[model samples]
Target chain A: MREFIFKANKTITSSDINLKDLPGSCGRLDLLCRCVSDAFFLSHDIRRDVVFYAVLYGQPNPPVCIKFVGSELKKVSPDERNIAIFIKKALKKFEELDEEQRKDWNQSTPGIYVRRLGFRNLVLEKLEEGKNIYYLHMNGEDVENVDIENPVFIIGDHIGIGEEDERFLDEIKAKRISLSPLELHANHCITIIHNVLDKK
Target chain B: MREFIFKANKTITSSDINLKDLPGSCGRLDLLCRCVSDAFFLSHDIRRDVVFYAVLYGQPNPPVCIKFVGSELKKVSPDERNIAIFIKKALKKFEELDEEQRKDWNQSTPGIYVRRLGFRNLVLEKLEEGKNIYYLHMNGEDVENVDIENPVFIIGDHIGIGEEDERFLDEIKAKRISLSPLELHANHCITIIHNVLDKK
Candidate 1:
């Protein structure tokens, strides 16, 4: 059986974050996006966020921790505070951007905020020793309505805390908090990493 | 890890075939009629015989062998001798039905068929022993529709196969088969069973 582990954090280096340009991020993101989009096109009434989280966080393996950095840590819960604090300490310093640079960043991606918001770390591990298969899915409520029978809106790669831990870190949310979009984003990044590893 | 295994004749005793009591041959006839009706609702372009075969042979866990005493065995294909032979041998006895009985069988229902037919031997084995979970599913496709991606119609149990695979047996047709439906049914059933089991 294939196992996936997913973790989420608010801080990670740009290199650590799985972006489209990075190895596996594109394919993983595409699969997640397609699943969510199919659901959205099928129905428009179901709450998709929970379904997405279920596929992402409910995997055999899930993210170990989701670190929040700087301002992003303000709303984090007490249970998540430890991860947030850790992110703050790992902050890397870069030369302050000039007004033109900031303007250019905003112009390049209109309406998108490029935060010096520090880094968010989401750790993902494949639970099956020596196997390269994992997944993390993410979607909002708008995507859950397609088929009540199968609400898996996102899936890819394992991102969990430890090799031995059967449960993913996201399992904690079941008892303490509702899954939020931040967690989904963090989980998506982890899936992206796994996709890259799969290619190799 | 958990596993489960099941084995039984894909065919069953008449007593095991359950249809809401509609009277003598009426009950059996009604079931087949209903199945045909359902198949028509799903597609009109396909021939009735195709629909009939699809339902009878497509299902995964058929409850009666095509050779059942009263059933007719027609030669459907010359090129595919095995399939033709199976259908012929299975339908041999049923050809004796009186015109009135045949008419009743044709006019009964107008929804998708949800049963299995033909040789009833079926074995569901969870090979990974010690694992307490398993799933089965059934699905079908219209004969004329070549694209498997978008099926014209589909229906099945959300979970486990009922006793002798009887509940889904009466609704067979040519364009549709039972295996996909059983597979889907089994899969969904296992998922639910696992959820409840985990809670324990």
Candidate 2:
């Protein structure tokens, strides 16, 4: 399974968003939407094996996690605004979502999901699954000679990953991998990693 | 130098566009803008080495060719609206752009350029320069076994390259390269090529 985890160190606004404004008020949402677009838009047949998450740290209350699962997602707006609307609705639902309501949303929503988990805790939780976790960083070991298969590839947003997320990676002794020496947009990195891995 | 060339075989509307409306009236523009944003914003000094071109082949007489040069462009707005405004303005400028008027604008603008060049002639003209030209296609050669350097990477717009453009490529015996079997957006392909070549 190809999974991507993005870090949005700010609140996901409830309104629409601007994808090109990747360094401002809606920048976090812009980056997250771009990652989902690139990751899951592979084609009609190859949807089920990918999932994406945004670890939203900015909040009105508890931190939220938003997810997109390709297999079950019947329709995703090509427009960032529609996706943002879905995201905003998911975020707003948090206000009314009791514990049981939360479970149903996670269980049923195809395009998105929300949870109350931090980056560190999320990584710790994923580690228990006995899966290979590869951290994407410019200085990490080059992927050219490495053998990485069916991995959970972690990437930062436009601004790079969160600081605490990096610390958790250190705790797990996470394997850091580099697709290039220069820092690239998160979505671009995923494509490069997919390009290499798909060859095998 | 890193380079990107996109083919937009559609109209770039003057009005504001919703990026989420990926299949709407301004789909090609949406794809073009996304490529420019992802390719140039590398979060480093090396952004100086890259340049991008968009070949618009829609109706209304002469075809339009636009470009983005990283080093010359002192500041590119993170806002797509501002960039869209620039593109609309450029399209409008084409009407008044006489041969003599062209040089003045090219000399003055830093980030972008708009010209009247057909895709066929553009490829033919570039072939005269003697630089290696690599065409991006899903069925092309993988980047892993190839040794391409400082090359000109050609990418298609939202709908892929035009038939005439494909013919021009054939005439030049263009080196076709692929990052994955599943088709990726132009910007994603640019990222993969840059990542591989940047490593070397």
Candidate 3:
């Protein structure tokens, strides 16, 4: 199974999101859209083989996380509008779904889930408890040097992981893996990782 | 030695590209911007180790083909607007720079070059005379089975390869390769290819 957790430092708000107004930055909206675009649209049989977590750390009314199951998604195309609308609808419906459930992570839709989760500790748990964590850190070791099997890849937007967050990564001993000597966009890194693991 | 060529069936025109009014579709403008964003900004070291060919098949606007020598590009950021502006400026200036040269391709600036070349025939020539050419067909073999060295990857935008174009690929006996059973976007195809080849 391929899993990717995206940490958006700032991309959401408690109010409505104007999907058309999202910028093209690594911040909340653009990066999340790009990340989701790659995670969902890039592959043919998405969600069925992959899972994506969009963790909003900026302002989720307390840092909310949206999880999507690939096989549950009905439509996924390369069009930005199509992707943006899907996320918007999911988020809108997710917010309503949250009110009806008392769980930390609730199934908003068939393949989509949402919850209130912190960034540092959430990842801290993934590294410590979940399978293994492969942090896409530039200063990390070469990906070829390690054997990452069914691992969760951690990706930061343009601003990258912060100091406090980095400290948590340190806490979990998240194995830093470098895809290339050069830096890469978050989505590109995900695509690369998929390519690497797709063959293996 | 990793190279990529993005083929646009009908995206650009000889007429001016209104930078202020760019559409958000999968056509020429949006596809070119997305492709450029991936080819240049996706990697940290920029183009020092890679080369990209943006082959426009729409108008042949002299059948424009933009060659980006990664090492020669100026500041490449993660902003699509910034990338779009850079490309728009280069294309505008490239048209003027070619008046002074006699070849089909001319250097626009330090690392960016533009020329008039057909999409189908250009790729056909590369397959017939140049090194190995890998057509990213969905029905092709697994990328891992065949070891490709410094090969040129051919990707198409949303419209994808047409009949006349497929006929040429058939002519060159272009070895079709598959990254996944599921279809992927053009840019994702590039990223996946890099992931597969970067280690080797």
Give each prediction's DockQ, rounded to 2 decimals: 0.01, 0.51, 0.37
Tens digit per residue, CA lDDT, model 1, B12-104: 223222222211221222222222222221111222322222223212223332211112222221111122223333233234444344323
Residue-level lDDT of model 2, residues B80-114, one tens digit each, is 44456567666666655676665443432566777
Q: Point out the higher-scoring one by TM-score: 2 or 3.
A: 2
Candidate 1 deviant stretches above 4 angstroms? A1-157, A161-200, B1-119, B123-165, B168-188, B198-200
Question: RMSD of model 1, in Å?
Answer: 21.7
For candidate 1, the lDDT comes to 0.24
Docking class of 3: acceptable
Models 1 onward score TM values of: 0.22, 0.86, 0.73
Q: Which DockQ value does candidate 2 get?
A: 0.51
- Give the per-residue lDDT digits (tens) of candidate 1, residues A121-193: 1122221223232223333232212212211112323243333332443442211111223232232232222
The structural similarity of chain B in model 3 to the true chain B, as TM-score, is 0.85
**lDDT of all predictions, in order shown?**
0.24, 0.68, 0.68
lDDT of 3 by residue, A87-158 (tens): 666566556754546246676556776776667666666656656888888778887678997588889887
Better of 1 and 2 by lDDT: 2
The alpha-carbon RMSD values of the candidates against the true structure, listed in the order shown, are: 21.7, 3.2, 5.0
